[PDB]
Design a protein around this ligand. Structure first.
Ligand SMILES: *[C@@H]1O[C@H](CO[C@@H]2O[C@@H](C)[C@@H](O)[C@@H](O)[C@@H]2O)[C@@H](O[C@@H]2O[C@H](CO)[C@@H](O[C@@H]3O[C@H](CO)[C@@H](O)[C@H](O[C@H]4O[C@H](CO)[C@@H](O)[C@H](O)[C@@H]4O)[C@@H]3O)[C@H](O)[C@H]2NC(C)=O)[C@H](O[C@@H]2O[C@@H](C)[C@@H](O)[C@@H](O)[C@@H]2O)[C@H]1NC(C)=O
Ligand SMILES: [Mg+2]
Ligand SMILES: [Mg+2]
Ligand SMILES: [Mg+2]
Lengths: 238, 27
């Protein structure tokens, strides 16, 4: 996360740290949607083997000992069959745990978005243990987050003078030049959310790709509303 | 409406009433 701040302990209870099991190395974020499923990005899971991945929930400061932290083995991984590694279209996946995730005040799922809402200009949040600068060293110990503005796809597509922003994508950035706030390396697969008047959070995007980080280009995310049907069918049939 | 992926209870709840309220300047 670039231009953001430290999250308070378990401020975003659905946040997941996806790691290489043998090295406990965080490489992507994720979002809990129920006690057996986590939403992530396709580019994070493509080619991964269930036995070599660990999902860590209830995390905050990865460098501290914790009684809240839960480490889960992965049962199966589902990458969107239409994922295009070249265009980044359909950059979505869902991961199933071997056992049920324990839910409490510190760990819980995030809500699904309303597919019939593009969230244009809504204030949003993005959290993760990604680098704080493009090219920075991965990864900061304490969970961070930043608030962003969800742009129109046309605007985002206009800024990316050499790349296409598809309808299944959603972008978010700051209102001050796109050089202050953004998600970065390590935040991928993580959540881009919005909250209602009651403080209830909904998953509207999945950290996907971008040029640099707060380097003049908006961050690009996989539009969860667009892939909502796929996520529902996948977690319901597996 | 949003699909219900978690029929077991309420989704999207944070213990902090002001969770994720970091300011976002208008520019
Ligand atoms: C997400 O971005 C939207 C577009 O913002 C603009 O474009 C981006 C790329 C960036 O450059 C921004 O800096 C640009 O503003 C936001 O919508 C715009 O919101 C601004 C307000 O911040 C609107 O403006 C106002 O327009 C009014 C009508 O002409 C003016 O009366 C008003 O002027 C007064 O206030 C300004 C500063 O606030 C003073 O300088 C003036 O002297 C005067 O006193 C503003 O100029 C603009 O019209 C909006 N653009 C569009 C196309 O809607 C969006 O902001 C959200 O949505 C808007 C509609 C409001 O509800 C905001 O409160 C709300 O935050 C951004 N979303 C977020 C979450 O930040
Ligand atoms: Mg608005
Ligand atoms: Mg473009
Ligand atoms: Mg549409």
């Amino acid at each position: 996360i670039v231009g953001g701040i430290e999250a308070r302990p378990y401020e975003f209870p659905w946040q997941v740290s996806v790691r290489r099991k043998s090295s406990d190395s965080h490489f992507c974020g994720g979002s809990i949607i129920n006690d057996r499923w986590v939403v992530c990005a396709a580019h994070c899971m493509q080619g991964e083997a269930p036995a070599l991945v660990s999902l860590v929930v209830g995390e905050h400061d990865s460098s501290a000992a914790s009684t809240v932290r839960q480490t889960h083995d992965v049962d199966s991984i589902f990458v969107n069959e239409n994922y295009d590694p070249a265009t980044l279209e359909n950059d979505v996946s869902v991961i199933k745990t071997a056992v049920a995730i324990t839910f409490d005040i510190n760990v819980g799922p995030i809500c699904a978005p309303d597919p019939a809402n593009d969230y244009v200009y809504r204030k949003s949040q993005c959290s993760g243990w990604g680098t704080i600068n493009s090219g920075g060293v991965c990864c900061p110990a304490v969970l961070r987050y930043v608030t962003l503005n969800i742009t129109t796809n046309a605007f985002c597509d206009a800024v990316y003078t050499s790349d296409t922003i598809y309808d299944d994508m959603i972008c978010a950035t700051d209102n001050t030049g796109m050089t202050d706030r953004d998600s970065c390396q390590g935040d991928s697969g993580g959540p881009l959310s919005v909250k209602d008047g009651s403080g209830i959070f909904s998953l509207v995007g999945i950290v996907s790709w971008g040029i640099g980080c707060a380097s003049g280009y908006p961050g690009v995310y996989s539009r969860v509303g667009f892939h909502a049907g796929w996520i529902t069918d996948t977690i319901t049939n597996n | 409406q949003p699909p219900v992926w978690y029929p077991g209870g309420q989704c999207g709840v944070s213990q902090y009433s002001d969770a994720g309220d970091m300011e976002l300047p208008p520019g």
